[PDB]
Design a protein around this ligand. Structure first.
Ligand code: 6EN
Ligand code: MN
Length: 300
């Protein structure tokens, strides 16, 4: 069965260290850049409200067939449904509780992880899920409060609208001679395959609420090694594809990378926790259940 990779670093900054995100990320860099990803738990009393327009939040998630690569009237597999945040959560909880035959919060994270990777390589069982991925924060607002006048800000919420850890306040303009956060409404087994960011950018990721998001990360010093293992084992039909396109279907069991000498670290990002990916740190993951994440690429 699946062997969980070693855990990535988790930092619990004090209020003093939590003052400046870029300063903190710069200070943890000697360790975190050697693991590719890391997790940051804010101080206990740092609890931003959820600021999306929930009444009007509507979206059509994308269908994900977990074993599509292994499986190589097709094209009309599933029927698309539009959801609200509530109706998607109802669907997501019903799927998970039916699949595991237990209440959603009782399913061990290790079991969802083991079952996810079994399903990815299974030819005898076709599991299909839906992912509300890459919803722009312009559509229904950011999950963080933003002082743009579109939604009321309470006095006790203003500090979060001005916080440097508010993803809308991360720097995004790269220096050159010559960008807003994105939202992810997850369900059990919804996933993102191995990739790096455009321009080898850092990314920061915040789980607003819900069940955890499970991550895998590879340090940048092993980026070429991972790409080598990909070219060896990825389908021949997608081998010659440019990286930007190949990254749409670069799903690979972490144990396969580990067996080929590639260092891989994991974490369960829980509600209220940040995940930072360092430059050229390949990462991939899946959601344990119904959750809501916000992410943005930033520069230092
Ligand atoms: C472009 N894009 C980004 C996705 N998701 C992530 C990317 N990087 C880090 C985290 C995530 C996440 O899903 O939490 C994604 C999932 C499905 C299709 N397209 C996607
Ligand atoms: Mn990413």
């Amino acid at each position: 069965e699946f062997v969980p990779p070693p855990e990535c670093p988790v930092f619990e900054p004090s209020w003093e260290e939590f003052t400046d995100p870029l300063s903190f990320i710069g200070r943890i860099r000697p360790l975190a850049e050697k693991t590719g990803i890391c997790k940051i738990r804010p101080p206990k009393d740092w609890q931003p409200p959820f600021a999306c327009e929930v009444k009007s939040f509507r979206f059509t998630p994308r269908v994900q067939r977990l074993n599509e690569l292994e499986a190589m009237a097709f094209g009309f597999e599933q029927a698309v449904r539009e959801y609200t945040l509530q109706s998607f959560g109802e669907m997501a909880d019903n799927f998970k509780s039916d699949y595991f035959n237990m209440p959603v919060h009782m399913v061990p994270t290790e079991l969802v992880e083991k079952e996810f990777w079994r399903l990815v390589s299974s030819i005898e069982e076709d599991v299909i899920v839906e992912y509300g991925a890459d919803i722009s924060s312009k559509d229904f607002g950011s999950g963080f409060p933003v002082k743009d006048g579109r939604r009321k800000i309470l006095p006790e919420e203003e500090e979060y609208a001005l916080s440097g850890w508010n993803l809308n306040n991360m720097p995004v303009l790269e220096q050159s001679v010559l960008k807003v956060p994105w939202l992810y409404v997850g369900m059990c087994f919804s996933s993102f395959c191995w990739h790096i960011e455009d321009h080898w950018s850092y990314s920061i990721n915040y789980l607003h609420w819900g069940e955890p998001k499970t991550w895998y990360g590879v340090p940048s010093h092993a980026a070429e090694q991972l790409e080598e293992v990909m070219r060896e084992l990825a389908p021949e039909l997608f081998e010659s594809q440019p990286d930007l396109l190949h990254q749409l279907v670069t799903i690979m069991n972490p144990n396969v990378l580990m067996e080929h000498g590639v260092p891989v670290y994991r974490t369960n990002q829980c509600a209220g926790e940040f995940v930072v990916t360092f430059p050229r740190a390949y990462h991939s993951g899946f959601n344990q259940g119904y959750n809501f994440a916000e992410a943005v690429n930033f520069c230092t």
